[model samples]
Target: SGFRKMAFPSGKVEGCMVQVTCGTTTLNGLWLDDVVYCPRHVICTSEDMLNPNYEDLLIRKSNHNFLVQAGNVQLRVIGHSMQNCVLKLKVDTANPKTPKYKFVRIQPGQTFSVLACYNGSPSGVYQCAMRPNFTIKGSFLNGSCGSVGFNIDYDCVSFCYMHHMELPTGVHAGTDLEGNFYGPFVDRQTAQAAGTDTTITVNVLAWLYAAVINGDRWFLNRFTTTLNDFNLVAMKYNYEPLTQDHVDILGPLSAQTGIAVLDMCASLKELLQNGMNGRTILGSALLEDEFTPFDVVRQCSGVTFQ
Candidate 1:
């Protein structure tokens, strides 16, 4: 599986919670983490379905299932290959079962939609600028909800106390120390000092939580976790077999960094409260031709990006 399509976090976002269930009641109004801010960009060009289960359980039946519960945050989805679908969305805090803003029947390959719940007010459309160039019919920030799950692959973002970065390979991309910039993948961490910007080349270890920026400059390590760290969790939750790396390097690097594997787990879980209180970790940006979402996670709760 040589998935080489580079995908990273746009600074336009805050952070994300990966593989979230449709009807899960765990979300609050905060920036959800666990799914995490992929460093720089991921290199998997294969078909990345954000919700394969949606396709698995309800494609042929064409059921209008619960897609989004835009409670405190405005959810904007960018990539989905929903062939023939409808997104019935509600923009007010009225009833959770009604959809005020809806996309009745869309053609194949339309992959962008936004639930703009801006600072609660005078209605505005969060439309695409020059590309799809259309408008979403929704009132100002009263809150939102929707029906139907498409092939969403990205969470537009926020910093939900992201501590464990997603380092999948020996050489990968990552962010800067200040939490702003990111760069290309390398075999080592950095040039010993924290400044300017650099890439990583970790021969000492096999994987790192990495990300890229404009194809250059890299953030050493901050908010991401290793494959082994994920695997350990996989073992705990699913009874998946823990590999040799579990005992080998996993404990060492974590101890070296002063970050235990459980730390990342709790780190991923602690931000759930953020999604509850202020769904305020997200940002609103005008979609444009030259628009590139910043991979930088801004500093708020923690003094941190670009």
Candidate 2:
């Protein structure tokens, strides 16, 4: 969980960049987020003495060495296109519209990294000053620019659970999962152990499997591998807590239970709120400090017949 630093000048000059690869991907044309991220990495801003100009920079040069661990590294300049690309240092000025960098003809496939460094400064937020001649593509768009160069802190990996004989492949049914779940009976050994006092966060995919198979011992133990592959329970909850630990005698029971509860909530919201009422809960109740979504979701959050 350590990073080696590489000394680089924090100057606001073109071609002043550094690349750090944290991981890789398989999808062609599609870049995976986990492909690059260090345990503790932050991109900041700093000023150059010779030039009264400022530039965005990254801290912790010592940890830049993560690129060495993630063998096949890649740093591609991303925007609408290279012809309209511009480089800018992230500066939190009073005005939110102005940019802070020089213009550079950014090619479609070109890359940039370690865009700037603040040289040991405290908490500087990086903002894209000027992006290429880019059009607002969709309603929800993550302004294209860079990736997590060196953030390695991973707390969600410990609660991993395996199913049947797929351990050798190391392939999980829910690879896109992240979050923790909490509730009664979730992380407990006995049904009584299902404590509303606590909760467990689990992979949504895993929880979906458990929910689909719960009470269906015949399908779980007797059904062919086809069931395991295709017997997917429809989960509507996209954001399940992933950091909660399952205290069950078996690995992390709470995680699965949590996943089930959250999934149920989601399904219910979709059915009742979206389908029946055509309105949203606004999640005010669930967000309250003391109230748990389970209170209402249990009665409303599922479509399965258990």
Candidate 3:
């Protein structure tokens, strides 16, 4: 599809194991990567991709069923179109003597949320329960029990974990090396030298990663992967591919001066980990925008417009 979406992490765990994964985790806190920080404008457009409409299986406690162990489990799936479907969860104990299933209905566009307790063994099989409106299922290995799968398409984003390094509003919109709007920060020679740094492109790469981690799979779809970089922005995972010129067209504009553009993003990811904040630049507004009009010169060469 020609759209952007969220991304969810895979895996499950029991009591002590939960602590091991999230506790003392480098990011810290309740071991939760809250997606609440998703940019307001971005969330508004990705309502479905950010909200899960079906039932999320939350394991409460070890249950009597071999498939579901007892403990508190919370299953939450968020993304666009998630509010349009319903999910029913069921647990098969393999033993013909006992069958336990939970049926729940979630209205379209509803965010998926489930908090339940289970007191059972881990040998049971669990999957989307039965619902006339919506029915989903998953298969586990014949003998083994823990492994499970779901529609990767639907699990685009369960949460938004992010930290930002922002521009001072007007300061960045369009400015030059000296921070002047519609002019290069310096003359063409100096600006060209600054843009040549590889770091500029790295910042764009980080932007791509952040886009994926935050559930923008649609954005990934736009890019056709290459031996060295992406071709163009695609639809879904490995869907339509892009040509070289396509990337050449969009990639740079997203960045101003290559190096400055790269540094700005790098500083942000660093601030996220250190509990500090910073920013970088690419070119002077005067140089990148006002200085020239020639396609090549607009970015790196010396040319004139008007």
Better of 1 and 2 by lDDT: 1
Q: Write the per-residue lDDT of candidate 3 for residues 1-306, one digit (tens) a residue.
A: 111122112322111111011111111011212110111111111233234222231132122211112235432323211111111112221222111211222321112211111121233322221111121122222211111111112223121111111122211111111112221222111111111111122223434433333343332222222322221211222212333433454455345433222233333333323432232212111101111111222223222221
For 235-288, candidate 1 gives per-residue lDDT tens digits of: 443322334443343455455445554443333323321222332111212101
TM-score of each candidate structure, all chains considered together: 0.17, 0.17, 0.16
Per-residue C-alpha lDDT of model 2 across residues 80-181, encoded as one tens digit per residue: 111111112221112222123222322111112222212111111221100111111111111112211111012111111100111122211111011111
Q: Give the CA lDDT, 0 to 100, for residue 256 in model 2.
A: 41
| Model 3 Cα RMSD, 1 decimal | 24.4
The numbered model that scores best in lDDT is 1
TM-score of 1: 0.17
